[PDB]
Design a protein around this ligand. Sequence first.
Ligand SMILES: [K+]
Ligand SMILES: [K+]
Lengths: 468, 468
Amino acid sequence: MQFRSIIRIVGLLLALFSVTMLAPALVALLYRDGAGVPFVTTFFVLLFCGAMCWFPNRRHKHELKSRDGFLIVVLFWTVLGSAGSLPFLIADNPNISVTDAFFESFSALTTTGATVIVGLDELPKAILFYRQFLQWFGGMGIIVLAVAILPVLGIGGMTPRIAETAKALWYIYLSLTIACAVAFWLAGMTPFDAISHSFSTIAIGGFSTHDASMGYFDSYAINLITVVFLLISACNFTLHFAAFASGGVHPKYYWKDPEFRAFIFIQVLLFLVCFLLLLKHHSYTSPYDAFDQALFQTVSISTTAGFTTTGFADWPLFLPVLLLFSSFIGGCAGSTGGGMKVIRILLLTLQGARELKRLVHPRAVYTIKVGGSALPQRVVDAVWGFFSAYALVFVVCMLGLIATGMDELSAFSAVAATLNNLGPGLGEVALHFGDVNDKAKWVLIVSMLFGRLEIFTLLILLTPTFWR
Amino acid sequence: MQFRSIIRIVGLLLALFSVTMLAPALVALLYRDGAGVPFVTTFFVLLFCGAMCWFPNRRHKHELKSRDGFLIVVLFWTVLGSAGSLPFLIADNPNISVTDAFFESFSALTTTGATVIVGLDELPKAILFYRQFLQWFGGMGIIVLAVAILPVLGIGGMTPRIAETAKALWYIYLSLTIACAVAFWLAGMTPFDAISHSFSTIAIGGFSTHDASMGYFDSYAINLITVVFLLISACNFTLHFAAFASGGVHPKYYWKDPEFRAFIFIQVLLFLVCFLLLLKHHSYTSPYDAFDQALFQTVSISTTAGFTTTGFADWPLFLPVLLLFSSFIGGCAGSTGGGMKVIRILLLTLQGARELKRLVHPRAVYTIKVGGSALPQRVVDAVWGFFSAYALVFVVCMLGLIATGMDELSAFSAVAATLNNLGPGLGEVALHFGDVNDKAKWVLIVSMLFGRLEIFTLLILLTPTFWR
Ligand SMILES: [K+]
Ligand SMILES: [K+]
């Protein structure tokens, strides 16, 4: 099991985390205020803990088989998500509840995007920043996690070299959060509203400074930037490594990957169906606004990002509800997405197809292939075993949220907002957490843990056969 | 393709069906009234059609491969369900709409149990009978269909001998609808309310004479009979053939089958969780009533029967919603059930299990086995390919119902009531069809067609590769 060597990397992360608490405090000094003291408390609070899991240790046992790696990523999200709830807890200045602080933290970390703190428009910019930061960080926590996770769950798609992997990611990540934040600034976003939004935009997070997210400034120019960098960020960073470990070698590098392709078909089709139905029901008086809102939504909520510019005014009930299911897809694998990713669908619809044909030609031998042949005994089994589970989780979560207190259709929209790391409600406009049954807030946090770990990795902790 | 030889069995069925229209008319002569003339019109109306598909024919081409059988059972339910809407259409005495007549017919035939005609308490007993009959018939239509359907979709669980199969079923069927109807009569049900209820009870139908179904007479004695014959009927007739092709050879014949076992565990556990939560929230003042209602519900709605004695008074929101998901199981295979049957779950949870283990011991070779080993390349693929489809259907149906007009959570409860051939609503008490958006009534009819054909057999009609 090698518990020790684990607690050591926990102290490494705890400690490695504290060093972040400064960036927001740097802001409660620079920007106005003076009330970002709860970060400097947190900085010592956690800096201290870290080197107290790591000092009574110093024991690099490397790898340590399957049963360790699982336990690690669970802790990674488990712990650093709990820590995050400290500056909220402490800084009882934009004073929040405890479950609230936890929620607004885990949701911040997991690039989910679900808020319990309202009236954030006028807050301390050290606290406003901390919220966007955790998303930008968690955002990294995923891409490097979706490269050192393939050794386990993410198959069919080390110790001193996994490092020089992420190393590369940092750049793709950094290039984007700047390439964006600048483009956002030219849009006219205050520098702070350009760097705190370009944080939660690459991370498919969903957090905003403004209370009404991208309701923001009605600028088609901003809504055009976001939608672009969502599409980009929502598309698999190992394909970016391809376009940008060389330079102008980008072209067909993308159009050649089928998941990237499939994803593009889905985005065009989804927008089509959404944009056209905005015009059938005359939801806007200017077929331009139709274009604006339709295209933004089918992209932000499709990719499990979570940004919203509409209340869904005269929008046909259909469109949100359709958009609520969209979130079950969105985000190529190895992206910042979160629904059972693009391929898992792509595959699913192929593996299902094979099944109908296997009804007419029960002789012929088909083998599900993407460019060159999946593994119809093995990876095929993994996909539509994951699906089932995904649904089993969803059903238990909704059923536990319904017991917990809150109503039927809401539990529905809540788990759907959480499990796909989406953020908003989206059903029949009932979309606001925070003042939810408190027990329910926990069910919810434990729901977005499932969505981030793609179920198994954490589902397997309950197994009997994971314990020995 | 052999179209001809098909249209011939259609005329055989149409005609073979007309001969039934007399049984209800026999009642509009015996029982009071005099207004069961629309049955005798129907009797000639259809008797005529039948021998007009079958006379310009007489061409027994036998079997005719896969692509015919599929087309047949589709027509079976498609046509005989349309005919059924005739005595309703005609008998504009308990006068009904057209989509209403079709709905109240398809739902009657498919042992679904969803009604659009209200105030049926005081109606012509020829029409009241016809409703229960269609369920009793359709009830047969399923057991003989789940024995001459294994040659196609129902695998891993002919022409002059498939006959002497059903032959046997008729008896098991007949024994039960009498064994019951008598027990119901001693309960005190009027003879007619004993034979029209013992119709829709074996057929896991759900239809009642009384408007408030088994609200009926508050007798624990009736609620005790129904629950028994539901459990019995809800359990796989080829296991009955075992206990009763010999006699006292019943004993472990059941307890040895794993699906029968699995089903029993689910019934006890479900009732436990339901019965105990009725006492935690003090929903009844006499822990006896708790026992009564809890046990009835977790059986009628679990097995996709659909009978209800409660409105769900002080019942915790949780329990109905939990019961609404229950309907996705219920009914061993080769029963009168309708959820993706007991095994499909049983298997599903096993095939899922195998998947977690395949995360820890990626070397070891597991093979999902029930008594002696399913086919981890083949039947396993079929199960959780069916599941996915089941969910795909559900989602499209709910999304089409939501477009069609009706609201979000209702569409949810409607498709869930239709696809599992359940009958009632069950969500947050909003449970009444009939006066629903009319287009939606069709989406609903075409939803319970899917539930009865277990998806594929009709899903495959849309295929490209089914057409040549
Ligand atoms: K999000
Ligand atoms: K039923």
